[PDB]
Automatic annotation (TrEMBL), chain A:
Catalyzes the reversible phosphorylytic cleavage of uridine to uracil and ribose-1-phosphate. Its EC number is 2.4.2.3. GO terms for biological process: nucleoside catabolic process; nucleotide catabolic process; UMP salvage. One of its GO terms (cellular component) is cytoplasm. InterPro entries: Nucleoside_phosphorylase_CS, Nucleoside_phosphorylase_d, Nucleoside_phosphorylase_sf, Uridine_phosphorylase. Residues 17-229 form the Nucleoside phosphorylase domain. It comes from the Bacteria. It is an enzyme of class 2 (transferase). This is Uridine phosphorylase. It is found in: Cytoplasm.
TrEMBL record, chain E:
PROSITE patterns: PNP_UDP_1 (PS01232). The keyword Cytoplasm applies. This is Uridine phosphorylase. Residues 17-227 form the Nucleoside phosphorylase domain. Its main location: cytoplasm. It catalyses: uridine + phosphate = alpha-D-ribose 1-phosphate + uracil. Pathway: Pyrimidine metabolism; UMP biosynthesis via salvage pathway; uracil from uridine (phosphorylase route): step 1/1. One of its GO terms (molecular function) is uridine phosphorylase activity. Keywords: Cytoplasm, Glycosyltransferase, Transferase. Catalyzes the reversible phosphorylytic cleavage of uridine to uracil and ribose-1-phosphate.
Length: 241, 240, 243, 239, 239, 239
């Protein structure tokens, strides 16, 4: 292998410069099938790789795992192999009342409630998506005919206290996160998520292009339709080549 | 009778305008408004000179901010309570990337917060990002004019000298965290220095207000009327 | 012609002047300048309006700063490049203590650093403290004019609204670290809010420049109730003893 | 089908297990569980693979965490909802001290918090300290196998590369505060770099849970099976 | 003549490498006069030092004074003269309801609510005790048979606002300490104290060994014989 | 008896509102005897208190000890007893070439390189001396005919690394204190010291009046009569 974790060489990619990065390894094969010549590359830990083809051009589908740490490994080791554009896809939980289940979220920038982003750029540096990547995801959202929301996403290093959950073992949430959800709602933040801040800060500070699209499956305020998000990310990839 | 503290304006003076073009210099306010229809001078208090014009029969306000985020925060807030929801920022900048030339136009996606006023609206971890539709109309307007357009991240400083790492000063001294900072921003892909975007974009993005940032390059620091003005007006037509 | 980028001033315009009286408003420069000998308009660029005058035979420059630290730091820096070593801040302010009345005078010893520009010259642990000789001259001058004077600390905020804990805004809300902040400032004996002193006093105290501040109270947000012009006469009188 | 969101486990699956051995890799859990009585696969979801085994007549769960604090915080929290109170960490590590060789054993008393997730449970002032009973058990288990043991502090980073001051990257750039950071940790007596302990030790010590870590040295950047035996032996004394 | 504050020389120690460190100068005499041939060394400000013998080996009892600043001087100047092991003895007030007056508290690590500890290592670095020092203090506590609690201690730079005391001249507490006591006890902190964070950060970042034991005098939540004998018994097994 | 640490009743002051605060407990007696009718009050730990009389008015002299933590106790507890004015007399070493041994330093404000000051006010709050106290110390310095310097002082929580001293056991200075002396020097900072930040912050934020005067005995860059005369002379004008 030419890289440490992914178990991949530069030859496997075959000139691929764009990668689609889901979170779950099980969804890697699924996305690859939408494109020409889908082939399994490697599988080590939370990193599953597949190659495909769009308009003759090779593309990578690779999993990140949960959190910025594992994501920082994946982006770096793909960048070592020639990947310059990264398209993030996931499923999230909205914190806004107007955002429904089945709706699509395209992230312009992330609230940096993580630790890994700080390893690439200081806190005052924006976790902003590449504009040409964001443009492609928005145009792809219109074509599929998705109910799309464009804005800011809060990226947390925890699923529980960082997203202000109290149904836990301790029932305790640290001071600075106590009452923070409502503050993000007041600031117009669409959703909680766990990888974007690291991903976006990594790319925006190292000359790489990044963009994120996610499908809403739950809403935390208001107490399976169609997977538009997957079709959007591959459509956007076509225009970014 | 003014309904706002600093601008010297009331709700009726805007004519139901919901979009503002915000240059830095009060002198430049007159010149932008006259490129549009029915240019009427509204008020001139301190660094806040306001004019009113028309785009395709729709009321548009042009108001200066002055230098820095403190006076910009005053203008944007008092325009926001006067009914303004969209703010398009026009200005001049000094690029730090060697491939950017004098006469090139820069569109800011997001700002590096090297200011203080942005913290008064959102914590540092919150992104100083521009509104997508504002940025898109701003990029599309740049193609029509045919200007050499650079799109990316801007470093927004609270000072002209040490925060931009200028050494030819009275002290010839820069505080330690700003030493070698320009180089660090250069490697991170930051294109330029200015002084107002971090405050503008943060206070708008955290308060449900649309914001866009455009600037024309007049100086390059690697080697130590105009397009941008035409671009901001064209973009303002496609926003409303 | 100009030796500096913003002010539009040469070193010849000052004629050897080493002291600057620095208001905020450009429209106050001419008025302060005419209280002294041979007043002349030097330059007017944006928020920076400068006038030269003579005080006891010695040249003095009056120059506006505009609102906020960023603009203040430009004027002070460029004046320091042009030879100015002593800076006297003049303005008008509100108050946050019930015992401070409209018409009183405030001499600032140090500022609470709620700006960002001060960080560009000194770390947060460094004090935003006025020059003793500048402060003393302003205190003596206030006594000579017969003004009711308060000496203490000013909160210097980068915003007019949320940093001064105002709720009548478009959002109607304040960030969590400014919630109840006015209450704890007035609990700490802070006199007032203002928007420039943290930058001025820090950038001077960390660069071998002398700085002082005096302000006229025109309103009190704690009070209700119903001529002075002391502040203007104080800054001029104090300047004579610092020359 | 499950009491928890991510692990795919119910409380009854653990059969009263209050102790958890937590490796990083879901491939390494089956092997650990088979070193004990009655090993049974419970669930495999994402980076979380869980096995139930028996030790001295008492049930024990072995569960992977994945890479990083975020995924570790999910596993530990959800295991604690299932009744786990003791968390023993096993892994393989590098070293930044020249006197520590390949094949040696490291026991972590506390971690340098170069992560983000630890701050979600306790502020930076709060120490990322291991439980005394867990650490004591691990040191005593290290003697019984005759291992070259080092006891001390570990640096725990949210990245594999810049946070561990690696320049062999795509950009070759390391941030200001991590430039020269490895030499700083070396002079302070820090043994090694790692990516999960700051999160693990902080959330446990601040929520009334017991935690300890043992690791095996497989490489040393300053130079040119004991660990698995220790963690199991130490789990016996913690019941 | 070799150190600036303590007024001691290498020869005054007589090859001693262990120091028992109380805060109060008056208790130094009692700790020293519990071992073989106690000799008074020097008294400068709050730095009263004595020399005694334990198992035929020279040992030092030296006062630190109140707080990290004065503690940092004493440790540093002791270290210059050849001291490598420091054992903190003192009296404390518990913040847990299950800890009684007369109980013994052993500190594994400290919450850093001080400034002096930052002068040696950044906040992310853990203020953790040396393991062998903690081991000996724990064993000594069982060897004397005292009600022992092992865990985390909050180390404040102030007696009043840092420990959330409102019965003061101002009658108010700064906003980040407002409600902080409830936070520390929810995170499992045993007690409030004023010296440990500095002591533990100093030693663990310099290659020095440090431990802490304290006897409970008061408990604010509810309605020296042991600790002194423990620190002496523990000092026996460290050389 | 009326207080915890100091051991003084309100009547032990006899209506005293001004306190002269040296660092050394052994200097309290020498300073008090320069005034009328000096009488010992209490000596507990590093807190030695005497009562003297100036112009018929009762004053109190009390030691602070080394550092902010011990100083924070004395100030607040004297404030409980009715003291509203604090004047610090001390000895110091300058970092500025033009300042000579024997010169007198009047501190306008302190650089907060401490921890205790944060317990009373956030970092952005200035550690500024009271103007009437500062003016009195300047006038008294003129009357004695002392070479006086008026400006900013750096108040460190440590004697060694915080003042950038490399002549130490480790020979190491933490990252952010590396090159700090040069930075303070270029910012017109006069000297290093250890108590002013805590003293001035807690007084200016709680309605107490504070000033500081110190005598230069050493200069790093290269008689004792004054300062002590100045602080007593200034105290008279503040009554």
């Amino acid at each position: 292998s030419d890289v440490f974790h992914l178990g991949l060489t530069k030859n496997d990619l075959q000139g691929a410069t764009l990668a689609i990065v889901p979170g779950d390894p099980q969804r890697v094969e699924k996305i690859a099938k939408l494109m020409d010549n889908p082939v399994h590359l490697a599988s080590h830990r939370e990193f599953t790789s597949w190659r495909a083809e769009l308009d003759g051009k090779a593309v990578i589908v690779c999993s990140t795992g949960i959190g910025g740490p594992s994501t920082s490994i994946a982006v770096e080791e793909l960048a070592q192999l020639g990947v310059r554009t990264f398209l993030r896809i996931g499923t999230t939980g909205a914190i806004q009342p107007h955002i429904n289940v089945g709706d699509v979220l395209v992230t312009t920038a992330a609230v940096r409630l993580d630790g890994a982003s700080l390893h690439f750029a200081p806190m005052e540096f924006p976790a902003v998506a590449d504009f040409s990547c964001t443009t492609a995801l928005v145009n792809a959202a219109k074509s599929v005919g998705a109910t799309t929301h464009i804005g800011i996403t809060a990226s947390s290093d925890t699923f529980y206290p960082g997203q202000e959950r109290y149904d836990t073992f301790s029932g305790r949430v640290v001071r600075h996160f106590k009452g923070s959800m409502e503050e993000w709602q007041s600031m117009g933040v669409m959703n909680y998520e766990m990888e974007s801040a690291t991903l976006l800060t990594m790319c925006a500070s190292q000359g790489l292009r990044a963009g994120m699209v996610a499908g809403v499956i739950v809403n935390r305020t208001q107490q399976a339709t169609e997977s538009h998000a997957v079709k959007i990310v591959v459509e956007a990839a076509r225009h970014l080549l």
